[PDB]
């Protein structure tokens, strides 16, 4: 009831999962060398070639 | 007009620009645009010109 930090393993697992998912979602916003990170903009501004 | 070493620079904002009438005229010898297709110049609203 009183002493904390006795459940490090479960919290560590949850942290690993959440961090992996968060970085996967954040990776979506990168530029990757293109001119924009959102596909609706690039489709609606350029020519197909 | 001016020379090449004292080129006039002007701002365009708070106006309704029509590019189709400018484009369809054949008086322009060359009209080559980068990053935007001229045909789709009439569906984009900008910040400053």
Curated annotation (Swiss-Prot), chain A:
Q: Where is this region: Heptad repeat 1?
A: 1-32
Phenotypic consequence of residue 43 to F? In strain: Omicron/BA.1
Instruction: List where this protein forms a coiled coil.
Output: 11-49
Report the protein's function: Subunit of the fusion protein that is processed upon entry into the host cell. Mediates fusion of the virion and cellular membranes by functioning as a class I viral fusion protein. Contains a viral fusion peptide that is unmasked after S2 cleavage. This cleavage can occur at the cell membrane by host TMPRSS2 or during endocytosis by host CSTL. In either case, this triggers an extensive and irreversible conformational change that leads to fusion of the viral envelope with the cellular cytoplasmic membrane, releasing viral genomic RNA into the host cell cytoplasm.
Q: What is this protein called?
A: Spike protein S2'
Q: Could you tell me which species this protein originates from?
A: Severe acute respiratory syndrome coronavirus 2
Q: Which gene encodes it?
A: S
Shown portion of the complete protein runs from 939 to 987 of 1273
């Amino acid at each position: 009831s009183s002493t904390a930090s006795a459940l490090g393993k479960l919290q560590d697992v949850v942290n690993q999962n959440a961090q992996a998912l968060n970085t996967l979602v954040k990776q979506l916003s990168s530029n990757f060398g293109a001119i924009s990170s959102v596909l609706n903009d690039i489709l609606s501004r350029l020519d197909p070639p | 007009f001016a020379s090449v070493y004292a080129w006039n620079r002007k701002r365009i904002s708070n106006c309704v620009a029509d590019y189709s009438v400018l484009y369809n005229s054949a008086s322009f010898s060359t009209f080559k645009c980068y990053g935007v297709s001229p045909t789709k110049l009439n569906d984009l609203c900008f910040t400053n010109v």
